[PDB]
Amino acid sequence: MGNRTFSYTLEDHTKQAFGIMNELRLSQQLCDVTLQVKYQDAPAAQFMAHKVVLASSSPVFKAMFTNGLREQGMEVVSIEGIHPKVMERLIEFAYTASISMGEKCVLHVMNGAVMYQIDSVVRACADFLVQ
Amino acid sequence: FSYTLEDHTKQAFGIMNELRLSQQLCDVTLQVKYQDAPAAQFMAHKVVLASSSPVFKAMFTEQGMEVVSIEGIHPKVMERLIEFAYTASISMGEKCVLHVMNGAVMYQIDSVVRACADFLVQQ
Ligand SMILES: *CCC(=O)N1CCOC[C@H]1c1cc(Cl)cc(-c2ncnc(N)n2)c1
Ligand SMILES: *CCC(=O)N1CCOC[C@H]1c1cc(Cl)cc(-c2ncnc(N)n2)c1
């Protein structure tokens, strides 16, 4: 009584939500950006995604997408300086909160994570290197 | 090795909520008309609303900003549901729990329905 308002956090929710966002990415629905990842004259690799989700993972993505002006349809964004396999895992991280690596690719991933200022991935890579 | 950063989705939602409140990257405007109350507009991200509700997901699955009209749900309810989608938290009280529950039912947001029922039964 007394017009008091109560708040309730639903603890399973953000994990289920990200799962749905990842599903939509993989079925290429609602996406508004296509990344064209050109590295060292390999053929360009394409990844579709949602700007709001990439921005939520990376201050670099957030600045890129919120700063200028385009046609507010599907934007094709040229990306250089990072291997597509690295960018693939950084996108997967933004949508899953998980990242996989091996001895042969941890430095690659760390380098990408530094470049996109994904601090939590940088720290996971560090953890991996030291063990 | 595989890592899961257990705090990440909470932090990400924080940022998406910030972008919603600053009206950045939004691709849907909900125009909500109820009874005699003033019309309200809510800008959001279709992918985030879809993440919260099978009804929003079906609704959206067009290019650019889409203006979508909704009738027969009070703007304050819709506002609570949007806030939930971006925070994982729902607010209610004695005099609006049925209204929030109705909204959650309509949008098939089962977690929120259950939280409303829990609240109602506690009274
Ligand atoms: C850990 C190694 C690994 O799993 N893979 C997957 C299959 O492709 C090769 C290899 C890999 C993974 C990543 Cl994330 C990056 C790279 C890579 N190779 C060369 N140059 C760069 N910049 N990255 C290989
Ligand atoms: C719990 C009651 C409450 O917190 N509020 C918030 C401030 O506005 C008044 C009141 C409220 C909240 C909600 Cl979610 C809905 C309504 C409402 N009033 C009339 N008709 C409808 N459909 N909803 C009031």
Side-chain angles (χ1 to χ4, degrees), chain A, chain B residues 2-123:
Chain A
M1 256 203 121
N3 274 26
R4 181 173 187 173
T5 47
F6 307 76
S7 288
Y8 300 103
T9 296
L10 311 198
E11 293 309 347
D12 295 340
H13 179 69
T14 66
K15 175 169 183 320
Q16 166 170 335
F18 265 90
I20 295 160
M21 296 182 293
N22 196 32
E23 286 173 355
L24 291 164
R25 177 181 66 107
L26 289 182
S27 67
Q28 309 186 325
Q29 285 175 100
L30 300 185
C31 296
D32 61 357
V33 58
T34 307
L35 300 181
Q36 289 180 305
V37 185
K38 300 141 190 169
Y39 185 70
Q40 296 181 166
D41 105 295
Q46 277 207 162
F47 307 85
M48 283 176 75
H50 314 91
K51 287 176 179 186
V52 67
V53 176
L54 293 185
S56 68
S57 76
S58 170
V60 173
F61 281 136
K62 180 167 82 174
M64 290 166 47
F65 298 139
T66 62
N67 267 0
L69 231 57
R70 59 280 294 162
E71 298 200 63
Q72 267 57 301
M74 170 60 76
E75 178 184 10
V76 171
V77 165
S78 176
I79 297 293
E80 59 199 7
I82 184 174
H83 201 290
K85 290 171 181 298
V86 172
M87 178 61 83
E88 176 187 341
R89 300 194 174 190
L90 298 183
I91 296 168
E92 183 189 341
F93 173 78
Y95 282 77
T96 64
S98 291
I99 183 103
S100 288
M101 57 201 70
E103 270 176 329
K104 280 163 192 170
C105 58
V106 52
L107 289 175
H108 289 153
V109 171
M110 183 180 272
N111 177 68
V114 165
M115 163 170 338
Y116 282 86
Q117 302 178 14
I118 315 182
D119 280 338
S120 67
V121 169
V122 175
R123 289 186 298 100
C125 289
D127 177 275
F128 182 87
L129 281 170
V130 298
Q131 80 186 3
Chain B
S2 227
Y3 291 79
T4 296
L5 287 293
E6 295 293 350
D7 296 343
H8 178 66
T9 61
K10 182 174 191 287
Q11 297 174 60
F13 266 89
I15 293 166
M16 289 174 158
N17 199 35
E18 289 166 4
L19 288 164
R20 175 187 72 99
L21 287 172
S22 65
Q23 298 192 357
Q24 293 181 107
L25 303 188
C26 291
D27 57 356
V28 64
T29 309
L30 296 174
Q31 288 177 198
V32 181
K33 190 65 197 155
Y34 189 67
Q35 291 174 190
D36 291 301
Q41 290 212 309
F42 300 100
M43 281 177 68
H45 315 88
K46 293 171 165 187
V47 62
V48 177
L49 292 184
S51 81
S52 77
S53 164
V55 170
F56 276 131
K57 186 166 87 159
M59 182 173 314
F60 301 132
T61 61
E62 309 85 83
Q63 191 67 60
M65 172 57 89
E66 169 171 40
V67 180
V68 166
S69 305
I70 304 296
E71 285 206 65
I73 182 172
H74 199 281
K76 283 173 185 171
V77 176
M78 179 62 47
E79 185 162 64
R80 297 294 174 87
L81 298 183
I82 289 175
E83 290 179 351
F84 169 75
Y86 284 78
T87 67
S89 173
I90 185 70
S91 299
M92 58 194 79
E94 180 194 3
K95 286 153 163 187
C96 54
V97 54
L98 288 177
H99 294 140
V100 177
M101 187 168 92
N102 183 49
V105 164
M106 267 174 43
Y107 281 78
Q108 302 178 4
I109 306 168
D110 300 356
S111 63
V112 169
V113 176
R114 268 177 275 105
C116 294
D118 283 352
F119 187 88
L120 207 55
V121 161
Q122 281 198 302
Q123 299 192 287

